[PDB]
């Protein structure tokens with residue numbers, strides 16, 4: 001059965017698309033305002049050398065801190081998000097931040113050479129750039145695999161904005177107080193996404209693949225948290241981060 005999208009579901013999609021268009025820059029025009037990327041010789045991928053230099057950390061921390069601010073703005077526009085207590089809103093944003101960033105970064109990701117391409121060679125990011133920020137292969141290798149699998153879904157922008165919203169409004173995040181309200185908000189979004197796929201996505205299982213990507217994001221989130229903790233132990237690391245990054249991941 002292929003029910004039509006209701007007037008409410010149409011309204012939810014239009015709000016999320018408008019929210020995304022106002023909070024995501026496909027021209028990466030603010031990147032010149034971040035602390036500059038610095039790339040040093042690290043062919044071997046030496047953990048000791050990367051931790052001693054963290055050459056790409058100020059730039060990548062700025063990239064993530066900037067994206068968190070945009071995610072905060074996007075979330076405020078999600079239907080029902082403002083009905084939650086401020087406490088539940090902050091818990092949801094903090095716990096989903098890196099996951100949402102991983103979804104948002106897919107637009108700049110290219111399979112032509114397996115990089116996030118955001119302009120000239122300066123704003124072109126590969127596996128080596130993430131390792132230069134103090135992260136290790138247990139995160140970056142499944143991260144590239146995630147980016148490819150996600151890119152291959154060829155998501156409509158409507159499905160992309162619904163997936164980010166569903167990711168943020170998750171009742172199974174630790175520290176949430178009103179899980180039932182969060183679940184009702186998420187179910188309204190999930191039903192919108194499911195209805196949308198069934199009547200707008202042409203042939204040739206997409207919904208189940210999108211749900212699996214959400215489970216993949218949980219694994220990546222946990223590994224990122226473990227890696228951020230190691231990184232935070234490096235002396236003088238806090239100056240290479242930002243106050244927002246310190247709060248969200250600390």
Ligand SMILES: CCC(CC)(c1ccc(/C=C/C(O)(C(F)(F)F)C(F)(F)F)c(C)c1)c1ccc(-c2ccc(CC(=O)O)c(F)c2)c(C)c1
Pocket residue numbers: 023024025026028057060061062063064065066067070098101102104105108116117118125129130133134135224228231241245249
């Ligand atoms: C460089 C790869 C990646 C992939 C998701 C990334 C960037 C930083 C970190 C790691 C972060 C940190 O752990 C750090 F700094 F400590 F090492 C922490 F989370 F704590 F900050 C990680 C794992 C991945 C990234 C993120 C956002 C954008 C990206 C794409 C597009 C846009 C434009 C827009 O959103 O409007 C954008 F701002 C950013 C781009 C192009 C790449």
